[PDB]
């Protein structure tokens, strides 16, 4: 029950269709910046079990509409529901401090609204939650988001089967995962720099979430 773990990780995140399993493991090791050995060694297994973003690493969920970047600068978001794990004011704020990271380095403003007309819609959900893209239960993948555009695009979803928190202690930082996911909602894809925010695996950090590769990546966009 380890080769099946690898076959599902590789399939879900896009290495299998791009690719023995050696070649596909080699695409993953490169894309995640692991020792590219081509074997299902221990380090690849460790990575395959680390919590991470559900967005594929090669390819996308699907063909999206448009050029996957916003063509206006007053970006409006809607917090559609909350998790029970944190006071609403703390959740409202984490999403505000997550968006602030990105305005701090782009020509975009983030304004909260109370309408399904928002460009970015934020929603907590579990298993199948109204997209075609069900979550997986506790741990595993923690969230996903979609490229800019109409309707479902630009939206950000968070696995409410997890325990959402902020700083240390138990649970995943809603602030850091949101900041990663809003990256996806602004046009960014996953980075391969282990210490970047758009790196797909979850790493708790204090101090600045944004890394050189993120600000450079957000810039060739806006």
């Amino acid at each position: 029950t380890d080769r099946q773990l690898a076959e599902e990780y590789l399939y879900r995140y896009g290495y299998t269709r791009v690719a023995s399993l050696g070649p596909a493991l080699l695409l993953l090791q490169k894309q995640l910046s692991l020792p590219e050995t081509g074997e299902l060694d221990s380090a690849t297994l460790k990575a395959m079990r680390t919590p991470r973003c559900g967005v594929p690493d090669l390819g996308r969920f699907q063909t999206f509409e448009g050029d996957l970047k916003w063509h206006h600068h007053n970006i409006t978001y809607w917090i559609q529901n909350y998790s029970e794990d944190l006071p609403r004011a703390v959740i409202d704020d984490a999403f505000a401090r997550a968006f602030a990271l990105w305005s701090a380095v782009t020509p975009l403003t983030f304004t909260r609204v109370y309408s399904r007309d928002a460009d970015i819609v934020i929603q907590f959900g579990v298993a199948e939650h109204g997209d075609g893209y069900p979550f997986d239960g506790k741990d595993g993948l923690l969230a996903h988001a979609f490229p800019p555009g109409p309707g479902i695009q630009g939206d950000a979803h968070f696995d409410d089967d997890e325990l959402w928190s902020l700083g240390k202690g138990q649970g995943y930082s809603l602030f850091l995962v949101a900041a990663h996911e809003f990256g996806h909602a602004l046009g960014l894809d996953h980075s391969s720099v282990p210490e970047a925010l758009m790196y797909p695996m979850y790493r708790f950090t204090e101090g600045p979430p944004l890394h050189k590769d993120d600000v450079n990546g957000i810039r060739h966009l806006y």
Partner: antibody
Amino acid sequence: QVQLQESGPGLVKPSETLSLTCTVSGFSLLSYGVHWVRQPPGKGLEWLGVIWTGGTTNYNSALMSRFTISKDDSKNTVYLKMNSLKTEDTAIYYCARYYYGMDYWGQGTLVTVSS
Amino acid sequence: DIQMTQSPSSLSASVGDRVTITCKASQDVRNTVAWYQQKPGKAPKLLIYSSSYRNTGVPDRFSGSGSGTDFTLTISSLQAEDVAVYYCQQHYITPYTFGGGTKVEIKR
């Protein structure tokens, strides 16, 4: 301007197969899910199924797997195929766009199952 | 399956009265309830979404509340043009079941 419209034959014979086409305009099936809802005349609405943006479906178990949904994102069409039609299937069929609610609906097409 | 129970199945009121329709969910359904207004020979119209949000172009007299299992649609001042059947629906878990309708008619 968002629009949806259903087309397909109204009269179908018992135990045969129905095909309705939902032709969409004003939005992208890559960005919105599309749902099918039916309503027997004078009765209330029953949810049938959904085809999501990425192409996976979900169907009402009450339809004993007789009913399927496919789409063509390029041509802006959603297809409902329901076979082994029973008399109970006589209703108006709607396709509707879903985004936190079914905000835009077809005009509905009546399907009479009859010999 | 989740059952949605709308009460009453019909009601008759006068222009200006305040009307209240309820919709009970057989299990917790969070805030994912939407209200539709359907006029005869026409398709339904999205009226309320996410329990309490008013779709674009919907007058202020239409209001929705509730969360969990019990949801309420309120027309604060019923007007003659508001005659229709009103349906509730949950979209928390497939099948996205509907209530049975509430027919609203007018006294005059």
